[PDB]
Design a protein around this ligand. Structure first.
Ligand SMILES: NC(=O)C1=CN([C@@H]2O[C@H](COP(=O)(O)OP(=O)(O)OC[C@H]3O[C@@H](n4cnc5c(N)ncnc54)[C@H](O)[C@@H]3O)[C@@H](O)[C@H]2O)C=CC1
Ligand SMILES: NC(=O)C1=CN([C@@H]2O[C@H](COP(=O)(O)OP(=O)(O)OC[C@H]3O[C@@H](n4cnc5c(N)ncnc54)[C@H](O)[C@@H]3O)[C@@H](O)[C@H]2O)C=CC1
Ligand SMILES: NC(=O)C1=CN([C@@H]2O[C@H](COP(=O)(O)OP(=O)(O)OC[C@H]3O[C@@H](n4cnc5c(N)ncnc54)[C@H](O)[C@@H]3O)[C@@H](O)[C@H]2O)C=CC1
Ligand SMILES: NC(=O)C1=CN([C@@H]2O[C@H](COP(=O)(O)OP(=O)(O)OC[C@H]3O[C@@H](n4cnc5c(N)ncnc54)[C@H](O)[C@@H]3O)[C@@H](O)[C@H]2O)C=CC1
Ligand SMILES: NC(=O)C1=CN([C@@H]2O[C@H](COP(=O)(O)OP(=O)(O)OC[C@H]3O[C@@H](n4cnc5c(N)ncnc54)[C@H](O)[C@@H]3O)[C@@H](O)[C@H]2O)C=CC1
Ligand SMILES: NC(=O)C1=CN([C@@H]2O[C@H](COP(=O)(O)OP(=O)(O)OC[C@H]3O[C@@H](n4cnc5c(N)ncnc54)[C@H](O)[C@@H]3O)[C@@H](O)[C@H]2O)C=CC1
Ligand SMILES: NC(=O)C1=CN([C@@H]2O[C@H](COP(=O)(O)OP(=O)(O)OC[C@H]3O[C@@H](n4cnc5c(N)ncnc54)[C@H](O)[C@@H]3O)[C@@H](O)[C@H]2O)C=CC1
Ligand SMILES: NC(=O)C1=CN([C@@H]2O[C@H](COP(=O)(O)OP(=O)(O)OC[C@H]3O[C@@H](n4cnc5c(N)ncnc54)[C@H](O)[C@@H]3O)[C@@H](O)[C@H]2O)C=CC1
Lengths: 139, 135, 135, 139, 139, 135, 139, 135
């Protein structure tokens, strides 16, 4: 497995790990909290305990070898920004990051994030789309 | 055809704005005037109201909507009461944002037709978006 | 004849102790072992359990009780889910301590047969106790 | 009205005020919070805004003229103890106090309270009694 | 030693323990904090670790056998009041208590304290007296 | 003969009131007007002033007092600077309330003629008061 | 005046404003706190009250017209990063920023800061240099 | 020739590292072992010690140094006592980091030969660095 890596196994991160597994994809799952890493042992090709803000730990992880790395760190803008900053130095092809708010988003754009995710807002758009389909698509 | 969104937080507001961009009419509602003002331009009608009050629900004409989205956040109790009431008004489709597991569990037994989990649901979207990189 | 008390706080524990003093058998339950131990000597049986879990509710034999008192406090969501479940098990009498107004409102629509408000109810008791000074 | 006085119009205090009114009894209702005093205007023979811990305010109230005074101050042991301390000096015939916990109860006994109320626990006993009646009294 | 007992070995309590020792008096020194009890081993006829608010511990101490008991509990009105309440039940001949403020003093009077000490204020009076002596007594 | 008290907290205020009761004149000073007002009736003169400012110290006429008591509390730095200045003005007797050990240590090297420790000093008073029970 | 602009008038920022004035340089001094802006009226060619994180306010300031802009925002990494982010978009020739710590520094590098200042550490080097001069330069 | 730095925070540590890079010997001292370990490799000697204690100051041989930099931070009282003591030991040059205005004022009267204000001093450096852009 060297295509998908998810850092931060909260509701958002853990959910992509699981869905990837369900779809038969191998995934590197990482978190600083062991209780979180263990909760995703059955869904990860490899579940490691590591501080994503530490360079050496990012090398002991081989994160440089992944095409897509999702930073799903939650209510910790600093760990989130620091992490995306490091792996952007490792010139990772695709770095996706969950943003906490407008400020976070603003630094993430210039810091290296290729895609920025706002769960709340983004799901609101998809829900709007589903509602529209109920009617329009005569669904 | 009717769409009503109760609770104009990031999630609720975003669906109101989307429905508007997609040229759909939408009743936006929230107990906080400041929240209502924020999305007044996107809704065919933006009303201040406590979705917990049956009287405020009837003068709202909510009973006449096909789809009502309860997007209350931290106020779990209000989210639960609100859905209980909409169910009493027999709304055809009631979609509710679940704050957590216990919330989902009561919502399921209460009459929510669809329960939305933004973080979890978005995570599945991203996993699927991640696969499509090689479609 | 059967009595079961879920949630052994000041209120719930006090009813367990009273039932015992009045020579009645009672099933005492709480998710916290320390709470259960505190009233073990007063209950015919004191069990650790999360009243939210259907599995833990069935192995508890709660379905066989005539009266079940849900005395969950601050955890409003657990109080609500618990009562929803007991209602599914068709308990004959389900009495619930209400934490606040919204709580009372959902409990009423959920199937609680009696809703208890300690402070308010005690206040009425005292007012009545105050009149009796001249009976 | 000079028989019942209730200090502290929370759930507990406000409830006795209301029940007394319902039963046709006149009652002096007092609270330091005006929004609380106004909420009980329709149920009190007199609803006054006053700090029960201040002696002069207790005299400007004429509290010395009541046979029963209920101290229903809530999560403020100090205001509660201080208040019962003062009116005990005013040698009030009956002083009833809502206690917050065991400690509060302990000082209240020696400080002058004639009756001490523990809503939570006390209601638990009455509920136990009602349950017993459902069966025993064949009710 | 069964004449003096000091509960609460802070600056105030520890200081009376020490001065008593200096004057050749035996003293029972008690505190809930072991690091405090050990700091006064060399000055106490007996230095015990105990929660003064617990009755049994007050009996395991034999506090009932002392003519004077000083409650020198500091910034903990509750532990202070509770403690003086208990030993007043043990009908101790003299109970002296350091008060934190006016409120504390007010409960202490009715609760059983024979003497109440306000270090700050009281020392202010003695300092005033010393100043007066510098001049008046031609000292 | 002159007495001046800087810092009208419990300690400082109490000495001002005592000196007054003992028919002595006293200059009471504090940076906080509310503190000064509290002891205005006990002092021959109650002045608002920042004892740290040399200008405010000279217009105060502090230099003309025989005894100046610095009773500053939590503001250790102000207590220290104030005493440094009074020493520059060569006040005959400067008595300072020490907040803690480090404070006492600098006060001793700074020129405080007497350093007062309320809690400790009162404790010795009580021990001595305790012995006198059998005098 | 259109050469130097200082945002954040704390000890650090206010000090450069003053020194610039002393040297006869015109300077734009800005702060969100009016009490801070007024404290530097006598030293600034223009002292304005403005939120540096707001774009429009940065345009109402004409900040785009300055060769050097110092961001001296203190204990507010977010306002600091956000501000340097904006003026970097305004393509300001030289943006100097006081960093709070290593993390701040890390984002500042990639975000656009041309020079990053760490007062504490940096002064430590100059003090070391002065000590060395006392001896080495036989000074 | 002798250099001693007391207080190895950002400021103090930085001067120790600089002196080392400039090939100078330096005695680094701090009450916290973790702080001392951090700069052990940069100092000719790194010692754990409470600069407030005269005994620990003498066994430190501080009296034999030409320049002693007191870089204590938040602990203003320790900074003040420490400098008072070094002055008693007649250190030739005592440089002290001032935490604030009151601190500077006592340090000046206490015997500090140089008082350093990092933020303010750096600000003047930057203003001067800003002018030099056109030298
Ligand atoms: N966590 C909390 O205490 C609270 C969270 N919330 C809300 O909960 C919502 C959902 O949260 P979730 O998605 O469940 O979790 P989350 O938002 O906390 O996800 C962060 C995950 O990343 C991991 N992580 C943090 N720093 C890391 C680092 N340096 N390296 C590697 N992993 C690291 C954490 O251990 C954690 O599992 C959020 O939107 C938030 O607003 C609300 C209140 C409190
Ligand atoms: N609000 C705050 O101060 C803080 C919030 N957070 C986190 O931010 C997260 C995201 O918050 P959002 O979803 O944007 O806000 P939200 O969760 O409050 O959004 C729900 C919306 O429903 C409205 N509402 C509530 N009860 C209602 C009723 N009875 N009738 C009608 N409308 C009603 C609210 O006014 C609000 O605008 C939260 O889940 C929380 O954990 C973290 C720190 C502080
Ligand atoms: N607990 C605390 O630290 C504090 C509580 N308070 C106040 O004290 C008041 C009185 O508290 P109490 O009524 O004595 O306690 P409580 O409200 O917690 O009592 C409810 C009991 O139900 C149990 N319970 C909760 N969820 C359960 C579940 N799913 N299944 C089974 N049992 C479950 C709890 O363990 C608890 O013993 C509260 O209303 C609160 O506002 C104030 C400050 C702190
Ligand atoms: N008030 C709060 O912020 C919280 C209360 N709770 C719980 O809520 C429960 C029920 O509370 P309630 O009965 O509704 O109210 P309460 O317990 O606050 O009642 C106190 C009432 O007395 C009044 N009062 C206070 N000091 C007074 C004085 N010196 N003189 C005259 N009146 C004075 C207050 O304004 C208030 O209306 C309590 O058992 C408590 O554990 C739990 C969390 C927070
Ligand atoms: N302790 C603190 O964190 C702070 C104290 N202060 C001030 O410091 C001043 C002087 O304080 P001190 O006299 O040194 O100490 P103190 O005021 O804390 O003395 C209390 C002593 O009694 C002991 N104690 C507490 N509960 C007890 C119990 N139930 N049974 C037996 N012993 C018990 C404590 O362990 C402690 O040694 C006070 O006037 C206070 O205003 C100011 C800020 C913080
Ligand atoms: N003030 C508060 O909010 C709290 C205080 N405490 C404790 O209460 C204890 C007792 O406090 P007190 O001795 O009554 O008050 P205090 O220690 O503040 O009294 C010193 C007096 O000196 C005055 N003063 C300060 N700097 C001055 C200057 N430069 N020139 C002239 N006057 C100046 C102050 O305004 C004050 O009235 C304190 O030691 C503290 O630990 C505990 C909690 C809160
Ligand atoms: N400010 C505080 O409450 C505390 C500061 N400190 C320390 O004090 C040291 C020195 O602080 P100073 O240099 O005096 O001040 P500072 O570090 O607070 O400087 C920030 C200045 O920038 C201004 N500012 C903040 N956000 C702004 C925005 N969006 N747009 C424009 N201006 C904005 C502020 O009003 C303030 O005057 C710091 O290194 C800090 O560690 C320590 C404890 C508390
Ligand atoms: N330490 C903390 O948890 C926090 C600090 N800050 C701010 O960070 C700023 C910068 O801190 P720094 O300068 O890096 O640290 P600092 O101000 O603590 O550095 C002084 C050094 O002197 C040492 N020291 C203190 N008393 C001593 C004595 N008697 N003998 C010998 N050594 C002694 C200390 O151990 C420390 O390493 C502070 O001014 C503070 O306002 C802000 C938040 C938290």
């Amino acid at each position: 497995n060297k295509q998908f890596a998810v850092i931060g196994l909260g509701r958002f991160g853990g959910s992509i790990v699981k869905e990837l597994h369900r779809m038969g994809h191998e995934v590197l799952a990482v978190d600083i909290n062991e209780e979180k890493v263990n909760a995703y042992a059955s869904y990860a090709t490899h579940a490691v305990i590591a501080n994503a803000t530490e360079e050496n730990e990012l090398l002991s992880l081989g994160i440089r070898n992944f095409e897509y790395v999702i930073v799903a760190i939650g209510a910790n803008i600093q760990a989130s920004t620091l992490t995306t900053l490091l792996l952007k130095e490792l010139d990772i092809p695709n770095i996706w990051v969950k943003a906490q708010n407008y400020y976070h988003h603003k630094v993430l754009e210039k810091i290296g994030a290729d895609r920025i995710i706002h769960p709340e807002k983004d799901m609101g758009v998809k829900i709007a789309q589903s509602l529209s389909d109920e009617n329009v698509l005569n669904y």
